[PDB]
Swiss-Prot record:
Protein family per UniProt: Belongs to the Ca(2+):cation antiporter (CaCA) (TC 2.A.19) family.
Record carries keyword Cell inner membrane: no
Pfam families cross-referenced by the UniProt entry: Na_Ca_ex
Cellular component per GO, a single term: plasma membrane
Cysteine pairings via disulfide bonds: none
Protein name: Uncharacterized membrane protein MJ0091
UniProt-listed InterPro entries: K/Na/Ca-exchanger (IPR004481), NaCa_Exmemb (IPR004837), NCX_ion-bd_dom_sf (IPR044880)
Topology of this chain in the membrane: Multi-pass membrane protein
Domain of life: Archaea
Record bears the keyword Transmembrane: yes
Residue spans crossing the bilayer: 3-23, 39-59, 77-97, 106-126, 128-147, 156-176, 192-212, 220-240, 247-267
GO terms assigned for molecular function: calcium channel activity; calcium, potassium:sodium antiporter activity
PANTHER family registered for this protein in UniProt: INNER MEMBRANE PROTEIN YRBG, SODIUM/POTASSIUM/CALCIUM EXCHANGER
Amino acid sequence: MVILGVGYFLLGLILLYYGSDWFVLGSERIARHFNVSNFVIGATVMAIGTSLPEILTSAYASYMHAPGISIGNAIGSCICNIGLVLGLSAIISPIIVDKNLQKNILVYLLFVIFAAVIGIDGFSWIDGVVLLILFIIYLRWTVKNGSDKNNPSVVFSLVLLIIGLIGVLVGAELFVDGAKKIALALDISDKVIGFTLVAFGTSLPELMVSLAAAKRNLGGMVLGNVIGSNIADIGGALAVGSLFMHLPAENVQMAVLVIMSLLLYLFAKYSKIGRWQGILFLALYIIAIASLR
Ligand SMILES: [Ca+2]
């Protein structure tokens, strides 16, 4: 079970490589038909596509009585998205943000701040419902604010979007499956490896898709996907997980997240999310994962 591990591994990379590229092309075309910006389609359709493994993970974790995991993995992804994902994407393709996109980003900053404030004592099922509503309020607002019978072109767009999404979701669980077989053959029979490599497996569709878009200089789409995913992780993953059990409090991760969200706001308004900014986001990401033990 070693060449099978590599076989699963390399196959996963193939389904993640092309899958994310099709998911981006499908999304870009869909945005053109629904007559919305690359940002809007990234903060809604794309976000929910890549943020689904994060919602299902949190909800299940809190279901089987592991709440500290459900929240720790919920916020840890938001930081991973601004730190690793956005950071890497900005180095590849610097992001100049439009002026109609900043109202959206400001809303994101406030929503994160709102989550941090009510998340000091912890997270009730009350907080969950509140945040769950705000999520939907955000979605219908993002689509509306920035805005057919038998069309062969639209169909092709949906094929790219659906096959592309199936590709990255399958490729991610082939990535993990293969890496686990390799790790086992390597001597790593520890248990945090069975949550570290899987936590990375949930952020893997998000990382790949954002990189695929970054390669095609879709800075707006990249930004939308980061913004949308974090809200889907907080307004959705963090919220749904709180319906089962009372999630604990992490006022050090939330603090860091607000900082990275604040920096994102300032960069996407008075400057840009370019290469040096991305380096900083990466720097803040590595002085975090090391200083948070
Ligand atoms: Ca509370």
